[PDB]
Amino acid sequence: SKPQPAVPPRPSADLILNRCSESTKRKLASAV
């Protein structure tokens, strides 16, 4: 039993769009 880490505000879709595949980008594709 372990208490997972309170997930933080995931990277700005854009930087993700800058460091991810077009696939994941489709999930965001919001940028800014």
Binding site: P8, R10, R19, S21, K27, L28
Partner: protein, 62 residues
């Protein structure tokens, strides 16, 4: 051919509420496609592309 980004074993079952957020269970072998912002990275596991926070994957062997 086939390309690869990186790898990082999981440790906690991350509750995925958003799309891009790649959901994974405790102790898992996800396919890290790349680094996304240090605190997160690209995650493609099971014909599905998303992302996850490295905090849930101290990694084991890249």
């Amino acid at each position: 051919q086939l390309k690869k980004g990186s790898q990082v074993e999981a440790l906690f079952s991350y509750e995925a509420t958003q799309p891009e957020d790649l959901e994974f269970q405790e102790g898992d072998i996800i396919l890290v496609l790349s680094k996304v912002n240090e605190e997160w990275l690209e995650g493609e596991s099971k014909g599905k592309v998303g992302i996850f926070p490295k905090v849930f994957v101290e990694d084991s062997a890249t």
